[PDB]
Paper text:
The HAstV capsid precursor protein comprises several domains, including a highly basic amino terminus that binds to the RNA genome, a core domain that forms the icosahedral shell, a spike domain that forms dimeric protrusions, and an acidic domain with unknown function at the carboxy terminus. The HAstV-VA1 spike forms a dimer and shares a core beta-barrel structure with other astrovirus capsid spikes but is otherwise strikingly different, suggesting that HAstV-VA1 may utilize a different cell receptor, and an infection competition assay supports this hypothesis. Also similar to other HAstV spikes, the structural domain of each protomer of the HAstV-VA1 spike comprises a core antiparallel beta-barrel, formed by beta-strands 1, 9, 10, 16, and 18.
The HAstV-VA1neuro capsid spike structure provided a guide to generate a new construct encoding only the amino acids that form the HAstV-VA1 spike structural domain (residues 408–684), and this construct yielded a soluble protein in E. coli. The HAstV-VA1gastro capsid spike was then crystallized and its structure was solved to 1.46 Å resolution. Structural alignment of the experimentally-determined HAstV-VA1 spike crystal structure with the Alphafold2 predicted model using TM-align revealed an RMSD of 2.90 Å across 264 residue pairs and a TM-score of 0.85, revealing a relatively accurate match in the beta-strand and alpha-helical regions and significant differences in the loop regions. We observed that the HAstV-VA1gastro spike sequence is generally more conserved than the HAstV-VA1neuro spike sequence. Specifically, only six variable sites were observed in HAstV-VA1gastro spike sequences, whereas 27 variable sites were observed in HAstV-VA1neuro spike sequences.
Numbering used by the authors:
A (entry chain C): 406 to 452, 457 to 540, 543 to 680
B (entry chain A): 406 to 540, 545 to 680
Amino acid sequence: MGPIPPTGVPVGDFFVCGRMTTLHMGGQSGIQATTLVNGMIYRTDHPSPVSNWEFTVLENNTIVGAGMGCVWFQKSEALVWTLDGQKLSGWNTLDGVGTTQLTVAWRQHNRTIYGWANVVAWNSEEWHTNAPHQPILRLTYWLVKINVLSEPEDFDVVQKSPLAYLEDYTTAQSKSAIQKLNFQTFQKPEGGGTLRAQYSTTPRQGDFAVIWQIGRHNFDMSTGKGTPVESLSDYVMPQQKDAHIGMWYRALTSVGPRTDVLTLHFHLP
Amino acid sequence: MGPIPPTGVPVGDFFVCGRMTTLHMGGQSGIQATTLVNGMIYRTDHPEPSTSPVSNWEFTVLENNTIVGAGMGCVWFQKSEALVWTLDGQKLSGWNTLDGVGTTQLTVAWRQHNRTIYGWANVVAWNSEEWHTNAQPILRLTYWLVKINVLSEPEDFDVVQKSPLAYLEDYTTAQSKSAIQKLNFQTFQKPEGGGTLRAQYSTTPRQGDFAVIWQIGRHNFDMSTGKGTPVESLSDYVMPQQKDAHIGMWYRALTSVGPRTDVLTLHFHLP
């Protein structure tokens, strides 16, 4: 027996495993941005309507989600498979996968690319937080297929990042809150309240990306539509989370390499 | 082809994808420890008397009663809930199981609060990846897949713990100046103080379960033998160039916070 080549589009809910490259790293002009992997562009001034984050998921002109992070990959290196229990039911490719009518708008430095990508599939997972009408914290991600080649300009902008909630802080030691997730502004060492979005290689037409948001929002697994996260602060998580969707460490780390391998799992409409 | 059941042990380098549970979360007596997933127990005082050399970290990898590595993190999983496969390029060369996988003679000693469990696990396979600093040994992330030999219930205890984070200056909880090229590791202490953090243990793996132990920091490692040096201590590091990594452990190893369990995708050189 020789090896099985990847063939056909996934039938039903599926897994994607690949090296996924962070769209931009957090920097300062003239300094290569090598570790700040979760700088999330946050812009409340606005120029279809857009969210407060870099990406906006749209049904026509209605915001149904936001993207505060983005990793991308080409179809050639991604592993794609489906399971029947523990049995392998398909060893597939993303070549020719269908898309939904949900679109993604990309807000760049001084322009917005509407129709930049279309949503293919998605996943989401909640983690109960202390609060009443407020949605609990959720991590939602969408697989998207890029429609157009757009080259983004690097620019300095307010960026939020996850971290532990630290008090009595020095670089050598701090008091770490036992139950908290924090999100704060990371500014560049020269100041200004902003951090440079230093873009790397960017997806082209037919490439794929995963965009995600984390924070208080609602989401409908059956349709891929929810609400955009409005803003980020600190959250108390009173119970353990034994999660399933595979994005949590990538979404919550303060530092990391620009690219690493991730396996994500996706639901179709 | 109809659906293929997992069949046979992996031959050659292989992948494992599954939900992996953090061995202990960073806490304080009486408070459920729900987010601090990278409290790494740091003890420079060697157990005395000791029948083997011991690292400064929770786990010591041993061969011929000599240190060949250390473990500062541990995630564990049951084999019945892991995907295991081998590749030839992008082609699938095996859809496998860890049932009946062979082990090496490299062992893992687990230093608990007041005892060390020798032979707690045997090494099955390993991987490692470097990331050059601006500097001595290179900064590396190294991990071993291990098969647990015994259920050894640990006692929760307060101890010095180090965690990764961004290098932050001019810090408040709302905003800080984040160094552009740095990784930092610092002591995280519980809010009640004392310089220590509680290791709050989860369910303990039993014989036949699997775990992944890893170390990050300056050390040497030989992919051909699975042996290297233990990381001695952790500080801050300047990374002058981008790292495009692939061993799948970097975000789990560098995050300051997270859920106790999530899916990870790792791959291993099998001796």
